[PDB]
Amino acid sequence: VRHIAIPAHRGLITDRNGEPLAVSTPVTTLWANPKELMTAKERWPQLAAALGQDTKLFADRIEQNAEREFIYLVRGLTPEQGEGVIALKVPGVYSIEEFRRFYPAGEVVAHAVGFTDVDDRGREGIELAFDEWLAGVPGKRQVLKDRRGRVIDVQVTKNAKPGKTLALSIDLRLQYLAHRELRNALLENGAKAGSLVIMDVKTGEILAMTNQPTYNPNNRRNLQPAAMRNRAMIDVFEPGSTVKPFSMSAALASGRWKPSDIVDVYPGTLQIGRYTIRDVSRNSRQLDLTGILIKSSNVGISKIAFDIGAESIYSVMQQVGLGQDTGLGFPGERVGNLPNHRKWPKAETATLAYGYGLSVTAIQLAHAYAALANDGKSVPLSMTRVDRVPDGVQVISPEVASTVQGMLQQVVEAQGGVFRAQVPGYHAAGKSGTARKNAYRSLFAGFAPATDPRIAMVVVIDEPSKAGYFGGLVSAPVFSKVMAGALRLMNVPPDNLP
Numbered sequence: 001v002r003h004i005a006i007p008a009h010r011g012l013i014t015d016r017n018g019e020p021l022a023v024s025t026p027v028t029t030l031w032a033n034p035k036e037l038m039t040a041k042e043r044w045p046q047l048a049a050a051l052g053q054d055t056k057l058f059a060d061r062i063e064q065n066a067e068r069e070f071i072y073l074v075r076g077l078t079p080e081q082g083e084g085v086i087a088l089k090v091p092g093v094y095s096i097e098e099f100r101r102f103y104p105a106g107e108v109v110a111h112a113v114g115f116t117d118v119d120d121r122g123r124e125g126i127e128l129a130f131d132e133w134l135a136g137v138p139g140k141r142q143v144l145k146d147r148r149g150r151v152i153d154v155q156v157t158k159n160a161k162p163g164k165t166l167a168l169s170i171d172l173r174l175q176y177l178a179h180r181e182l183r184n185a186l187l188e189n190g191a192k193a194g195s196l197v198i199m200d201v202k203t204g205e206i207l208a209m210t211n212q213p214t215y216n217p218n219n220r221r222n223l224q225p226a227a228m229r230n231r232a233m234i235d236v237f238e239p240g241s242t243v244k245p246f247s248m249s250a251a252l253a254s255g256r257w258k259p260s261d262i263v264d265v266y267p268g269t270l271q272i273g274r275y276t277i278r279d280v281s282r283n284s285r286q287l288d289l290t291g292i293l294i295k296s297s298n299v300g301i302s303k304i305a306f307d308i309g310a311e312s313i314y315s316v317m318q319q320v321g322l323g324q325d326t327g328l329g330f331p332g333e334r335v336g337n338l339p340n341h342r343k344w345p346k347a348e349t350a351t352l353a354y355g356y357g358l359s360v361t362a363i364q365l366a367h368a369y370a371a372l373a374n375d376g377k378s379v380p381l382s383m384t385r386v387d388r389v390p391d392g393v394q395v396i397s398p399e400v401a402s403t404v405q406g407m408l409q410q411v412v413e414a415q416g417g418v419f420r421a422q423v424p425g426y427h428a429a430g431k432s433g434t435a436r437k438n439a440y441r442s443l444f445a446g447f448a449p450a451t452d453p454r455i456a457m458v459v460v461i462d463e464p465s466k467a468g469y470f471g472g473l474v475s476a477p478v479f480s481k482v483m484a485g486a487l488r489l490m491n492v493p494p495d496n497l498p
């Protein structure tokens, strides 16, 4: 009297609308009792052939496992193929009906979903993070065996309970769009890597999370580690000039600045001891605060930071979640960091203000822009479909967030701005960036529609290699196309029709 396991059916993963993303499909595995095989040696060659194995090597393996009562022949054949071997009636050959995961969207959502074991245990991404929920509990079968031991099947001791279903926050339609457009952007620019995150400003849901390179989890032969990283969550980078709107939020909240205030940025450089702060465009003197963002003046943002102090900038960044724990619990997710100082020297103050010295994830950057677009209120992040929205936390004053939103709409819409971020039919807001690593990261971060925001988006492209490499040239056009499609796919009313 012994017990054999009764495999449980692992729960289905779907996207937010119910589209299957991970399904456990019936699969047959074959094992043998060598002691029973040792009584039917003349059958071995035909069985070896039916397993695509060499007869002599196969025979060797059963001889050297002769004294054992159990060994695997092969795992995870199709039910019809496993019937082929079962049909040739070899003594001591048995079958086990297991389940095997299939991923219908393949590489399009591989980084979010992850994958399972040969045992159908989650070992990456969502499959790992929600493993206890999805797994269910295997059963126990009471079985009688003779002293060979040939099994000669009594009753179910304990039933199998299937795993529970799970609906992600991801919208597969948005995911496909983002994937295709990020991929196109990568190839066109000779880029090495990239991330794109799309977030629902009002509910905290991650509507799309896509990276390049990626991999097809359905093929065990193409699990190459470098292409398996969910870069949006597990890789960090200096956000660069994409953090300037949060510097600006500190300035406006300080009570010392308004959008119409002027800063003098001539001659487009500022010498701070050994360190020189430099702008790309150096034919400006007086700029207002909206102008500082539109032209992305480093000198301008540094002078404001000197006036208000680094501490005020650090707290806005901390509050919005940059370099902080997101609390999602995605496997291998990084926290990043905001630097700290007892006393902040000028050079450190300036570099913070325009996005160096700190390290963030793409998901953190998108979460920060989402809170800004949601009138300064940060809704907790979710990877699962949200039906009842949790209470959000006020992180920037509504009034300040509104002003900064307007300024950002101007960076997209005014002359001298990131016109390639413009979304046909809609008002859009955002900020470009280009950070060093002569290697660069091209960036665009933003949200839309400007009159009542719905979606925040970050596009991060690593090391473009074709002439133009600024965030406004490389990443902005991706924001434009993906945002255009996402908006209409979500049936959001156009707010900039003529």
Ligand SMILES: *C(=O)[C@@H](NC(=O)[C@@H](C(=O)O)c1ccccc1)[C@@H]1N[C@@H](C(=O)O)C(C)(C)S1
Residues within 6 Å of the ligand: 240, 241, 242, 278, 279, 280, 295, 296, 298, 354, 432, 433, 434, 435, 436, 440, 470, 471, 472
């Ligand atoms: C923010 O990213 C800023 N970048 C730089 O000032 C500058 C640097 O970090 O050394 C730089 C990087 C790459 C190429 C040129 C200069 C400003 N914002 C950028 C943007 O909006 O994309 C720039 C390039 C306009 S400068």
Ligand SMILES: [Cl-]
Residues within 6 Å of the ligand: 333, 334, 335, 336, 337
């Ligand atoms: Cl970290």
